[PDB]
Amino acid sequence: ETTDGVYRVMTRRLLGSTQVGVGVMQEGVFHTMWHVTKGAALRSGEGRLDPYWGDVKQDLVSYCGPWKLDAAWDGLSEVQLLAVPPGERAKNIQTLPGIFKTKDGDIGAVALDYPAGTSGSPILDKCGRVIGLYGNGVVIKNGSYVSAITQGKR
Amino acid sequence: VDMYIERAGDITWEKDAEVTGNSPRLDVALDESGDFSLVE
Numbered sequence A: 001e002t003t004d005g006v007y008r009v010m011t012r013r014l015l016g017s018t019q020v021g022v023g024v025m026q027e028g029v030f031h032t033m034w035h036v037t038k039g040a041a042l043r044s045g046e047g048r049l050d051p052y053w054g055d056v057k058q059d060l061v062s063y064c065g066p067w068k069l070d071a072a073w074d075g076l077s078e079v080q081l082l083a084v085p086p087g088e089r090a091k092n093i094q095t096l097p098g099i100f101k102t103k104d105g106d107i108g109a110v111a112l113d114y115p116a117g118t119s120g121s122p123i124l125d126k127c128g129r130v131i132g133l134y135g136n137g138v139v140i141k142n143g144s145y146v147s148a149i150t151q152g153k154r
Numbered sequence B: 001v002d003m004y005i006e007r008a009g010d011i012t013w014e015k016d017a018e019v020t021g022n023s024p025r026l027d028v029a030l031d032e033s034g035d036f037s038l039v040e
């Protein structure tokens, strides 16, 4: 129920299901963006995953334990978005990150546009480590999107 | 509201992948609610 991998985050009512996000299972902890779940409990197979930690400002939340993803973008190399869009197979998209320049340091950022329910898709370095999650970003003048490479503290 | 997860794949790097997108350098601010904004 906690096997490592990338997962879709779904909701079901009285009809079909909707994909609201994506997350990463690593070391028995599920990692996703706060705006995907709002810290609601997650059903996994027969079991239940409970929120352990989160921070609305980082837009992150973990389940079952503390945040485990500590890999950092090197500021130099290309990365891969492992995009898991609603209703589509997981696909790797390679890109050279731009940068969000903030008063509190620079954050790598990827100029890739996907549906809202792709939120929480992991961003990878060349060794396959997750250097952050996709889906909290900005819209620029031409209407395209730039996502921060959002990474938590371990 | 049944919120649940389902596996979508293994987390691996894809050899010979599509390289795309630009690399913008943007001045941004982050508020306490987790929203980025562009600096004018």
Ligand SMILES: N=C(N)N[C@@H]1CCCCNC(=O)[C@H](CCCCN)NC(=O)[C@H](Cc2c[nH]c3ccccc23)NC(=O)Cc2cccc(c2)CNC(=O)[C@@H](CC2CCCCC2)NC1=O
Residues within 6 Å of the ligand: A035, A059, A113, A114, A115, A116, A117, A118, A119, A134, A135, A136, A137, A138, A139, A140, A143, A144, A145, B033, B034, B035, B036, B037, B038
């Ligand atoms: N708008 C474009 N081009 N792309 C977005 C990509 C969304 C990726 C996943 N992340 C989110 O859903 C977060 C949630 C909220 C997190 C909050 N802390 N959200 C966002 O970061 C932004 C934030 C934001 C809104 N305003 C701003 C102004 C300045 C700076 C930042 C922002 N929120 C939006 O982007 C909301 C929005 C605003 C305007 C229009 C649309 C959505 C409608 N677009 C879509 O329906 C899809 C369309 C793509 C589908 C795949 C093919 C390419 C197109 N794209 C999109 O929905």
